[PDB]
Design a protein around this ligand. Structure first.
Ligand code: A1AYM
Length: 209
């Protein structure tokens, strides 16, 4: 049972700008997604200080990057706090409503796309390299959910029937045909070292077989 929702007007406007604007420095998408994973890990880590049972769904706090050349997908897995259904449908879109508006004003005052993280809406930079984004997420207080969008102004949410993750968020980037360089091992390593060297959680790059 799949529910279809319309993006908020400002968010849909940002996604169209991110997809249609000529901008060559696309690698920053990884910095933003990794930074988002780091925030989610900070959150579950801080909650576990006063409530250790919040880690019963998984003690390890890490970030995995999983390129897949046959499916042309790049997956970023974190064991962070995860997202509830209300987050996927309401709360995150409400918070991003104002950050998108501010980011758009700045883009006309001289700012460029690489500053998107300063407005809390870095997640949508995924559409620099992806034609479709799938998010599998599990929060301690909710069921496992699957969020998906190919832009166009709508997204879908459904309960995920696949493999249980215990706790965290899986971001699956279905890459555009011309962005397969982000599936190469030495390219991902160069980007992580350049932009995410100081992330305070272990980042593991799965090599393919
Ligand atoms: N940084 C932001 S606004 N992230 C975000 C918003 C809505 C979503 F459904 C997902 Cl998966 C992520």
């Amino acid at each position: 049972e799949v529910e279809t929702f319309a993006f908020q007007a400002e968010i849909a406007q940002l996604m169209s700008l991110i997809i249609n604007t000529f901008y060559s420095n696309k690698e920053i998408f990884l910095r933003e997604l990794i930074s988002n994973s780091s925030d989610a890990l900070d959150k579950i880590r801080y909650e576990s200080l006063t409530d250790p049972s919040k880690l019963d769904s998984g003690k390890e706090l890490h970030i995995n990057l999983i390129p897949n050349k046959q499916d042309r997908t790049l997956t970023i897995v974190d064991t962070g706090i995860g997202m509830t259904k209300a987050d996927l449908i309401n709360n995150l879109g409400t918070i991003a409503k104002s950050g998108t508006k501010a980011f758009m004003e700045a883009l006309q005052a001289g700012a460029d796309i690489s500053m998107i993280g300063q407005f809390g809406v870095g997640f949508y930079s995924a559409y620099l390299v992806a034609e479709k984004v799938t998010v599998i997420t599990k929060h301690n207080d909710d069921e496992q959910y699957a969020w998906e969008s190919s832009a166009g102004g709508s997204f879908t949410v459904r309960t995920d029937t696949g493999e249980p993750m215990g706790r965290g968020t899986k971001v699956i980037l279905h890459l555009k045909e011309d962005q397969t360089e982000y599936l190469e091992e030495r390219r991902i390593k160069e980007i992580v070292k350049k932009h995410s060297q100081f992330i305070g959680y272990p980042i593991t790059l799965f090599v393919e077989k």
